Amino acid sequence: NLLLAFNLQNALKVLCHPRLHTPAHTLNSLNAAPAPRDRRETYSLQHRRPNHMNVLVIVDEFYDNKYAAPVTDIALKCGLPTEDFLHPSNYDLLRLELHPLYDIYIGRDAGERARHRAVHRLMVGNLPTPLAPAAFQEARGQQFETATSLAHVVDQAVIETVQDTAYDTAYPAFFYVVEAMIHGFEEKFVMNVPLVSLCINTYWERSGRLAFVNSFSMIKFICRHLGNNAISKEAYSMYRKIYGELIALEQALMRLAGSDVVGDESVGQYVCALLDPNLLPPVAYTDIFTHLLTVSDRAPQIIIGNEVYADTLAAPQFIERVGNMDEMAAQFVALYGYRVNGDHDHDFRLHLGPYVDEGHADVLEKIFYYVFLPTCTNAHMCGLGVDFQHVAQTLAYNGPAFSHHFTRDEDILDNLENGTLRDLLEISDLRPTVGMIRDLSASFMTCPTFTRAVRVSVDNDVTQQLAPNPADKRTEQTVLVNGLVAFAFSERTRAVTQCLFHAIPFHMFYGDPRVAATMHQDVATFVMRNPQQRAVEAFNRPEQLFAEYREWHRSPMGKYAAECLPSLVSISGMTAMHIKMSPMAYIAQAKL
Amino acid sequence: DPARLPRDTGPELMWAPSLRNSLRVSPEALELAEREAERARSERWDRCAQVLKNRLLRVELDGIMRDHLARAEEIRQDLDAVVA
Amino acid sequence: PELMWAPSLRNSLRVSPEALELAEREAERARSERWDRCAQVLKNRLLRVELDGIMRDHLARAEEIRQD
């Protein structure tokens, strides 16, 4: 009659064995089966590499003359509850769900025998909404809040104001061109202090909600700079709370991580996925691509249009740094000749900045782009790409910024001609006096030329690297270089900005067809013909840009992010479902 | 001389219709693959155009980069012969 | 119902006299394009592997610079 408890920690004598993690036995059992599944998928099995480099041909070509809308089985799972998932009618989906760590797909019989291939489910949130419902994840987040004694600095109010910010149809598209011209540089941002100090002030007076939340670099700069009574106080307190949330959440995650190391390196890169540096943020303005090649023991391969770049010594052949804009003054016309006399298709040169040396080790923008933003705003933004030449022709072929005898502190909206900057500034209704538009145009001396998308393929961790197939120990991830992720578009906005922005549905959180159909009139026909594709989980995306099986965030994350109520519990649940399924992840989960 | 039949199942006899002697064809998937692969074939033809031109540009480029060393070598051999 | 032609060995293909003589020629036309694209990327990596040789030779000649 002793009341013995059975914790999780006493089950680690079986839950941490490698035999639970090798799918080689179950792939031997599946591939020797005398009758495999007839319904094969062939939508997002393998990321094919593009030959060209510009992504506008990939997006436009992908949606041009398309009438086939197939969906993957992982998206087929998380659309129905538990009670009918185990029904005998859904045996075709139940046939392959036979391991929690492995969503085994069959592929195609394009060769001789179609082989059941196993890709490892990385984090715990990749379990389907059948076998792990969403309320269970929010309650695990509430366990995470009390297990680490997290102090949420955000209330409901900041979450709802960023929520209806990202549901504003009349979001100012001029903020996109400000974000595009600055694009995450400190010395460029100090040129635009009276620009953005007027921008977010007049947005706070026109609509009450805050702006510029669609990029980490802008809100980080607003946390660093502009606290000197530039913006109104209640607008700045939202940005200060948002930046306090990421450092508080990272402190909670390392309280989960614990003070134990393996070898000499921390265990924090094994237990979580946000603390893993090998996960990369989905938008990179500065260089991090040379940075993780110096810090990773697992070998990554940053595939830039079937160019490998697997070693750190060949850095300037694939990526050049623009540095600061002062040393570039000898090569301004050289960079312009590279712009106008360069073949940008089949150009495998990345135009980035230097790696900034912060102490955070790149975890804060991963948190902001992965657990903060797609839950306070229910996965309803897409990653667009700018053409820098067209916005450069916009901001300098106007009246007053060209003449330089038009004085500085006059309004620009009464003497600018009927260009596209006039209808850009009319639908937004801010009054940037000329001169703050002058250095805005003068940033073009070291802006990039195009927003390339690149598929970094980092190997798994050594705990979960037990698949026999050496092509599926890698979990790829696309990262949209130099372009900004952005919210929904008005049709008034899209008609005047079709010559400025093109949408790239690249990520599971950041490829969404409600926003993509606004700023792209190709998917606007595609979801007109296939309205079931309007869900974020079943949306088709280019497999040369986004391989859903070979991705860190799979479709159950998109199912949870689309239907979570934006609040504290949703944020804690999303950051609690980025825990990996490693044996030491089970150890650090059993400890707390 | 053929003959047309809906169905059968599972013979030992080699020339006998079945479900196992039925070829698993899908006209829609193959046509899309064809239409897309045709587009890929079309894009394959027009990469072999102007490597002659880029070769001429790299030839004149190495010419003007040999120009700097042909400039510098004689000036470096002049400045050390004044030691007499 | 859907009708399937039963397998007999007198079942002929749909008659193809004109099919192959242009097909092999356009095949070799695409084949030469494939081959000189592969030869182009071969020569690109071949010039990038030889270029570091002359730079390593120049950095070896930079030894004699340091004592002059």
Partner: peptide
Amino acid sequence: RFVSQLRRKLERSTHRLIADLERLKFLYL
């Protein structure tokens, strides 16, 4: 003895520069 310094700094400036020219070559292709 003043010739053995300016000449040396200028040939160091050109031996960095010829590497910059081959770097511009790698920038081309």
